[PDB]
Design a protein around this ligand. Sequence first.
Ligand code: CLA
Ligand code: CLA
Ligand code: CLA
Ligand SMILES: CC(=O)O[C@H]1CC(C)(C)C(=C=C/C(C)=C/C=C/C(C)=C\C=C\C=C(C)/C=C\C=C(\C)C(=O)C[C@@]23O[C@]2(C)C[C@@H](O)CC3(C)C)[C@](C)(O)C1
Ligand code: KC1
Ligand code: KC1
Lengths: 179, 172, 164, 89
Amino acid sequence: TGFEEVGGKPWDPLSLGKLEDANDTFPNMFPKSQYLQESEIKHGRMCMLAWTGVWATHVGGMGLGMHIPGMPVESDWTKALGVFAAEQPALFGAILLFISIAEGESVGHSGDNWRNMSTKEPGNLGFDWMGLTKKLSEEKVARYKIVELKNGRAAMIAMASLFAMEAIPGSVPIMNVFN
Amino acid sequence: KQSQALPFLPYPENLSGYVGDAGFDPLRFSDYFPMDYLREAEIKHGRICMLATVGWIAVDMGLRVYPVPAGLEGVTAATAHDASVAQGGLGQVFGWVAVAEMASWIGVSQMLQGSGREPGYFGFDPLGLMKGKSEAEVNNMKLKEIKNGRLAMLAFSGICTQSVLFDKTFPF
Amino acid sequence: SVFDNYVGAKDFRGAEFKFDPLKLSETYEPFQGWFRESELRHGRTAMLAVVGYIATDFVRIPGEMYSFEAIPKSADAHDALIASGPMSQLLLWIGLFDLVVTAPAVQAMGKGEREPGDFGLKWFAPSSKDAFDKKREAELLNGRLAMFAIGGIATQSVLNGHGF
Amino acid sequence: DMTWEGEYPPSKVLGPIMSKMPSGLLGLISIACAAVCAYSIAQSGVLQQQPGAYENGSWVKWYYVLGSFGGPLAWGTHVASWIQRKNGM
Ligand code: CLA
Ligand code: CLA
Ligand code: CLA
Ligand SMILES: CC(=O)O[C@H]1CC(C)(C)C(=C=C/C(C)=C/C=C/C(C)=C\C=C\C=C(C)/C=C\C=C(\C)C(=O)C[C@@]23O[C@]2(C)C[C@@H](O)CC3(C)C)[C@](C)(O)C1
Ligand code: KC1
Ligand code: KC1
């Protein structure tokens, strides 16, 4: 299971995953469980890349300083997209167009997961590409889905931690022991 | 079942009448558009180009109307368009093509809603030439019109491009 | 199941070589007809490319724009013919072929009425399908080898600068 | 007649031409109309600011006006591409 930090049962204190069938007043105005699971996996996958992008481009201590020769040079991650979209406009568009086509294709084949009418399981974007649902057993790929979910939730808290430091400069005291 | 012009592609299956058929159409415009419209457009593109390639060849090889009206004196076929619209000329040609094309539009519009009109059929056969001919001979002459029209479409496009790009008259 | 639907599970010694480590033909099983039509297209392109690099280093077509004085070895034939015209001429006609022929060919392949790789050159094609299947794996093996050969030739002629 | 049920309309709501077109052809047409519209808007932007090419509305080109109306054609052909894909072409 993936509920080991929160007991052994699913965790929902505000009961936000029950809002759609709680009453009858706002019909299909709240997403059902397939959209909520797919948005949880997608927010976690973006936060797993985004926290790595702040960590790999931070030039101070404990954060490893990677750089691509040819890219614009702004180690401040809160302004690096503005200097990349201005100096490399064709590369910025080709990345966005790839993100655009992948995002529309991810629901263009399936159905309405907002209304639990989708035909695919949430998180599966057809990007296995190397094994591994065919290679690994059925309980190993179920273990690795819980791993990607929990590493996605951990990086989501981490990106909320980075969002909070830039807004309220005393939000995270643990991020002061690394400098 | 297989296309004749492309014997690895299947037959497009909407070309089964239509005397000039090679089974050619790879992009399958006959699958999406009405074939009565497509053949009417091919025929009209053909007989316009048959007049155009003969009119461009005649004007480039001498042959002005005599006597030459004012403003068309030193003029080739690649510069006779704008010179004729300033003289008058094409303004009257455009007026009478417009009343022919507005009347033929009612023919095309009624053909696509029924009416049994053949694509590329007007009443224009004043010199006889079809006085009780058999349908195997009528369809043969329709094939000569579409084949010669298909050639003059590629010919005029060759003549008009080469006369302007390399800047010459038709015996290049 | 791409090894039973299609032919080419061989190595350089002729032994049976089921080579799909990433299992792309099972992950993308509807795409395996496209995978073979594009493997042959990459193969048949690289076989003409490896010949056209070696034959250029000795023979040019007889024009002065194509001469040995203009393009020194073979590696400047791309960049010193872009604005000249011959690279734009082949870009037109291959792109016209790919729009008018190949794109209706790959949709007829997906509908199931033509085999992938078949563009109608059946003159020297033998019958007795296993004999044709032996010709396809000879096309595949010479194709797959040329895809590394044109990778080797065009890379080594830039870092070392030597011809052949 | 044109009423429909379920998750997707039938092909016949696209008219008599696009109801027979493949979803991949309508999808690639849509990117072609979107790229022509985005090129027409960007090139009319650089014609507006060029100091010898904007006077008395000389920045307006007929091919850039006609190209910019690929925008609503790119919207419709990508909606039509989705409908043909849901209908199995
Ligand atoms: C090779 C030729 C070429 C050229 C010259 C351009 C040029 C351009 N492209 Mg294009 N593009 C190209 C090829 C090209 N592109 C290709 C091959 C593709 C793929 C098909 C694209 C697809 C594409 C897309 C999708 C977009 C562009 C856009 C642009 C414009 C960028 C302007 C900009 O970044 O301001 C951005 C503004 C700034 C950098 C100023 C802000 C800086 C402050 C300080 C930041 C402060 C923080 C901020 C508030 C936080 C915001 C976060 C939020 C964005 C999430 C520029 C005119 C963009 C555009 O403007 O479209 C209308 C755009 O969205 N292009
Ligand atoms: C607003 C009208 C609108 C509608 C009804 C659709 C509908 C569709 N889109 Mg499209 N799309 C749109 C705008 C729209 N789109 C815009 C603005 C973009 C960015 C350029 C796209 C980029 C896009 C891609 C890459 C893909 C689709 C696809 C699809 C289809 C499947 C659902 C999906 O994945 O899209 C999701 C679309 C969005 C999340 C963006 C739309 C959100 C809008 C802005 C909401 C606000 C609407 C507002 C009331 C009025 C619009 C004002 C206008 C100026 C924007 C569906 C037919 C897929 C497809 O099947 O193509 C064949 C697909 O792959 N769309
Ligand atoms: C990968 C394919 C390929 C490409 C992109 C090139 C590209 C080039 N060749 Mg090379 N060539 C090739 C294969 C290729 N060649 C092959 C296989 C041979 C041996 C016959 C040659 C022998 C050759 C000579 C003798 C010369 C060139 C020259 C050149 C350069 C310019 C003129 C030209 O196009 O030559 C004309 C092309 C040929 C002579 C080869 C004919 C093509 C063969 C028969 C395959 C085509 C078959 C296929 C079915 C055609 C379908 C076309 C499609 C649109 C319908 C250009 C960089 C010229 C140069 O000076 O280089 C700098 C030059 O003098 N090539
Ligand atoms: C298999 C195969 O073959 O290919 C595959 C390849 C691929 C890519 C993977 C696939 C896909 C996904 C696709 C194609 C997604 C495409 C989405 C696409 C292409 C488009 C949305 C436009 C939205 C809006 C709001 C646009 C304009 C909206 C407006 C309002 C305007 O333009 C206004 C304007 O006009 C006027 C009114 C006045 C002008 O003066 C000014 C302007 C211009 C401003 C497919 C489907 O699987 C097919
Ligand atoms: C039946 C009604 C009718 C009248 C009453 C009329 C009259 C004139 N035509 Mg017109 N005309 C047609 C019909 C009529 N025309 C038709 C069916 C066509 C084929 C589409 C046609 C084509 C041309 C061309 C190419 C030219 C042309 C001209 C003149 C000009 C001669 C004055 C003169 O003879 O001294 C007088 C006003 C020439 C010109 O000078 O235009 C400024 C000229 O170049 N016409
Ligand atoms: C059937 C219609 C047709 C015409 C009307 C035509 C015309 C010209 N071709 Mg093209 N061409 C093909 C077809 C046609 N070509 C085909 C099917 C192929 C194989 C893909 C092809 C390939 C090349 C290459 C490699 C070159 C080339 C050129 C020229 C140029 C001068 C030719 C001359 O006078 O000898 C004129 C405009 C050369 C050039 O000078 O480019 C600056 C050049 O290097 N072509």
